[PDB]
């Protein structure tokens, strides 16, 4: 009878949401909230099913019923709300370019070898021998880095091997709500001395969204998380829409949290939290349909993906 009786070993919120989901035997048809999805093989269904579970369960874009561009005005409001301006960034010095109009340092950053003005050197205080580590005042705002989004690295440098990342999602209902939420959240995070990166939708036409703001908290996530949740809890329900993803932990209306995936397997990497969880659910649902028993296929596939099936916002 109970949603949890029939779906044992799985978080109740995912048990409840799977009642809205069925896969036909053979796995060439599926239905998610009466969004019907068909395909010519199980394998083609896996990605069509993965996408629907993502849209329906993670994003909240529903389609089973009868029913891009950077904006400089918003980029300005979002960039104005950033308390800091600079993130010290370590790389290895490759070469010192002695140009009279301004010396430049070719530095191997983790993601790219870059040519940086010498005036951005922090440590050491004079350009070292090539091969030596340097530290650089690199801008914290990165408006092009993440398409659709305005991105900021926090003042404080991130752990060398970053390690686990706590993702916090804010369901901003509009751009004005985003700027307030963005400001609030960066405040708290910098006050709490958080090691983080964050981003916010930079196209006004793309709200509302449950990941309209995303915070990436590294190291010790509890100070930043507490700080963030106190700084926005006042706006939860009003500036944030109330619904959040079934895969996440709800901290307040429209404020959810999770962890970056930690999937054991090679080739099942570089996925977002939402797509990773949806793919594993589709894989377990598909596997079910290719043979209570459904809940075990699902628990199995989540576990093989490194997801805690009692707590799918987290990883084993």
């Amino acid at each position: 009878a109970s949603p949890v009786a029939r779906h044992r070993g799985l978080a109740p919120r995912l048990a409840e949401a799977l009642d809205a989901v069925s896969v036909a035997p053979g796995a060439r048809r599926a239905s998610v909230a009466g969004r019907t999805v068909t395909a010519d093989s199980p394998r083609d269904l896996r990605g069509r099913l993965t996408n629907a579970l993502y849209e329906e369960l993670h994003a909240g874009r529903h389609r089973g019923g009868a029913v891009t561009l950077r904006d400089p005005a918003l980029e300005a409001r979002l960039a104005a709300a950033v308390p800091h301006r600079t993130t010290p960034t370590r790389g290895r010095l490759v070469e010192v370019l002695r140009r009279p109009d301004g010396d430049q340092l070719v530095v191997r950053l983790p993601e790219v070898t870059a040519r940086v003005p010498a005036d951005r050197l922090l440590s050491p205080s004079v350009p070292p021998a090539p091969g030596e580590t340097v530290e650089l005042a690199l801008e914290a705002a990165r408006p092009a880095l993440s398409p659709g989004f305005f991105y900021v690295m926090g003042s404080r440098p991130l752990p060398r091997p970053a390690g686990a990342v706590r993702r916090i999602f804010l369901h901003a209902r509009d751009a004005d709500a985003a700027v307030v939420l963005w400001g609030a959240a960066l405040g708290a995070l910098e006050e709490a001395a958080a090691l983080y990166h964050a981003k916010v939708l930079s196209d006004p036409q793309d709200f509302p969204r449950r990941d309209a703001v995303v915070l990436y908290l590294h190291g010790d996530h509890r100070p930043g998380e507490r700080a963030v949740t106190e700084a926005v809890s006042r706006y939860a329900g009003t500036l944030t829409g109330p619904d959040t993803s079934v895969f996440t932990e709800e901290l307040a209306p429209g404020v959810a949290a999770a962890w970056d995936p930690q999937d054991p397997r090679p080739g099942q990497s570089g996925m977002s939290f939402g797509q990773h969880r949806a793919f594993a659910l589709a894989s377990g649902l598909i596997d079910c349909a290719l043979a209570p028993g459904r809940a075990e296929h699902v628990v199995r596939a989540l576990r093989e993906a490194g997801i805690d099936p009692l707590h799918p916002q987290n990883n084993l």
Binding site: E111, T113, L138, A144, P147
Partner: protein, 335 residues
């Protein structure tokens, strides 16, 4: 922004103002009803000096030339404005190729236009080398360019920077440009620099000469082959094994090889002495097509956060073509 300087040239040319039926670009009717394409480049202004060096030579060209270009109506180089006659019912070659209308015939007309272009006084022309590939970026991106790119683009740059074989091959390709017979070369060709009039049924126009130089003719040949390479191995496809993506991609290329072969026949019709003067033209063109692949993957990565497996695979095809141009030249039919 740049509307003042554009409305001032149109006024001084007798074209009135831009009607609301239309760096930055503008196309459509003027208050006088003349169809104009307004191009703006932020400034002197060397891209416009190159554009103009083409419009001088293009004036000395019959309307029976396989190489047709929109008439220049005017220009203010110091403000970075050019105006040309809009091609009636303009359909770009990118649109055409996406709809399967960039056929073998149209590829032959492109080669004839490009073959024609390379045979046309070379005195007014820029002999500076085109920064393509960007060799300094292979060592190190400017910090300000890093802050204007996506994570996928940045990742695509680092993969090339860390690939010594490719970096070396590109330095040699650019080094070889001063050891070959140069020709008037477009230097930045893509399917979108080719326009048909009459909504896809009309004649062929080659446009965008902001990179026009006296240069290695392989740049243009390779660019055209490179577009078919990128179309066949990437565009037509955008959860599979990498070996499957390469297999599907290799078969798409093979089915697209006649497009390249046709271009090259067109090319040789109008430039029959190309290999008598440059035996290594096929090989250098293959290497340029190989780079062109990276260039096009890096550009498309603009709106991506990761490099998907199709892009990773497509890249791997370009490394093969760039590191093996001779064989690629034979595979591609530029022999």
């Amino acid at each position: 922004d740049t509307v003042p300087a554009v409305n001032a040239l149109l006024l001084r040319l007798g074209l009135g103002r831009l009607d609301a039926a239309a760096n930055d670009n503008w196309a459509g009717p003027t208050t006088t009803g003349e169809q104009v394409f307004v191009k703006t480049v932020t400034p002197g202004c060397p891209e416009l000096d190159r554009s103009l060096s083409f419009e001088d030579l293009a004036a000395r060209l019959t309307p029976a030339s396989p190489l047709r270009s929109p008439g220049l109506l005017g220009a203010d180089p110091a403000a970075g404005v050019m105006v040309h006659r809009l091609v009636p019912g303009a359909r770009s070659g990118a649109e055409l190729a996406l709809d399967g209308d960039f056929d073998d015939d149209l590829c032959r007309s492109a080669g004839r236009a490009v073959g024609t272009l390379h045979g046309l006084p070379v005195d007014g022309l820029d002999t500076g080398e085109a920064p393509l590939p960007p060799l300094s970026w292979l060592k190190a991106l400017p910090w300000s360019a890093v802050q204007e790119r996506s994570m996928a683009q940045i990742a695509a740059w680092q993969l090339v920077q860390d690939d010594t074989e490719v970096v070396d091959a590109l330095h040699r390709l650019r080094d070889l440009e001063r050891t070959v017979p140069l020709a008037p070369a477009h230097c930045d060709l893509r399917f979108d620099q080719f326009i048909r009039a009459d909504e896809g049924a009309g004649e062929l126009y080659l446009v965008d000469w902001e990179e026009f130089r006296l240069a290695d003719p392989a740049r243009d040949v390779g660019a055209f082959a490179g577009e078919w390479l990128f179309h066949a191995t990437y565009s037509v496809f955008a959860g599979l094994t990498h070996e499957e993506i390469v297999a599907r991609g290799s078969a798409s290329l093979r089915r697209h090889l006649p497009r390249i072969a046709a271009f090259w026949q067109g090319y040789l019709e109008c430039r029959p002495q190309a290999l008598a003067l440059d035996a290594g033209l096929p090989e250098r063109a293959a290497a340029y097509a190989g780079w062109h692949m990276y260039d096009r993957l890096i550009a498309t990565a603009e709106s991506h956060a990761t490099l998907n497996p199709v892009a990773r695979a497509a890249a791997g095809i370009g490394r093969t073509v760039l590191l093996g141009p001779s064989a690629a030249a034979r595979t591609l039919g530029l022999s």
